[PDB]
């Protein structure tokens, strides 16, 4: 599987019939139909003891992996129950400023999309997890082009050493809590991940707050390569699913 013509979201279904399921992802957040629900909670985004470890491009994305044989950098609260532990983070981007997101607010689509990954702790692994329906929580940021985003340029500075697939370097000392914006304020519904297996195993947890990125950072995620080294050159860009049918699902918002 893949993002192009030829193995790209369209065909998922042959490998991964539940690419047509109840609770798929993404979705486009209407804004007026979300609900406020006043019982949410605040998110409790706890990163301080946060452990990067590594920086890997898998031929789809790259993922910053961290230590989470710990409780070290946890998500709770909001509509979590529970303690859910940051695993990793990776993006999602396009070839153009005007598309990259995987979620669309009121149909627009942003740049790119930050997807931090957590598990919940009462599955004792991540691989259990993904099979459980509340096995995952991901937080997702949007990006817009704009100014640059001083917490992401570590991440921009290392990708020349990851260029193709099945490369990795070093990624100690991160702090991902340089890549949120100054709001907390989300919208959360029931779904999938967005790449196969496309496990209807996730709460998304949307924050309505974009970060703003130079376009100079995202030129450079666009400089990736989705092919091994010595294979031609396809660049990684436009690896995005686009929004899947709301279906019998509602998105409430933590905010009026
Ligand atoms: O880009 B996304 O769709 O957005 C959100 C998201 C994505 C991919 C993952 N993800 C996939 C894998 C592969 O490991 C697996 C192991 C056992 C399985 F049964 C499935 C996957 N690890 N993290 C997690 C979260
Ligand atoms: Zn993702």
Known sequence: WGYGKHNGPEHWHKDFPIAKGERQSPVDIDTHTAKYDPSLKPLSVSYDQATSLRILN???AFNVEFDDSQDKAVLKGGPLDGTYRLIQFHFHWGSLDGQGSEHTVDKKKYA?????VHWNTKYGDFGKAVQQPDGLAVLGIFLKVGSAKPGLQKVVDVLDSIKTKGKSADFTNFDPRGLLPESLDYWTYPGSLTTPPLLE???????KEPISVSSEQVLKFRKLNFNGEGEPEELMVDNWRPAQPLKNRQIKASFK
């Open 58 to 60: 898998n031929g789809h």
């Open 201 to 207: 195993c996730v709460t998304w947890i949307v924050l």
């Open 112 to 116: 790119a999309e930050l997807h931090l």
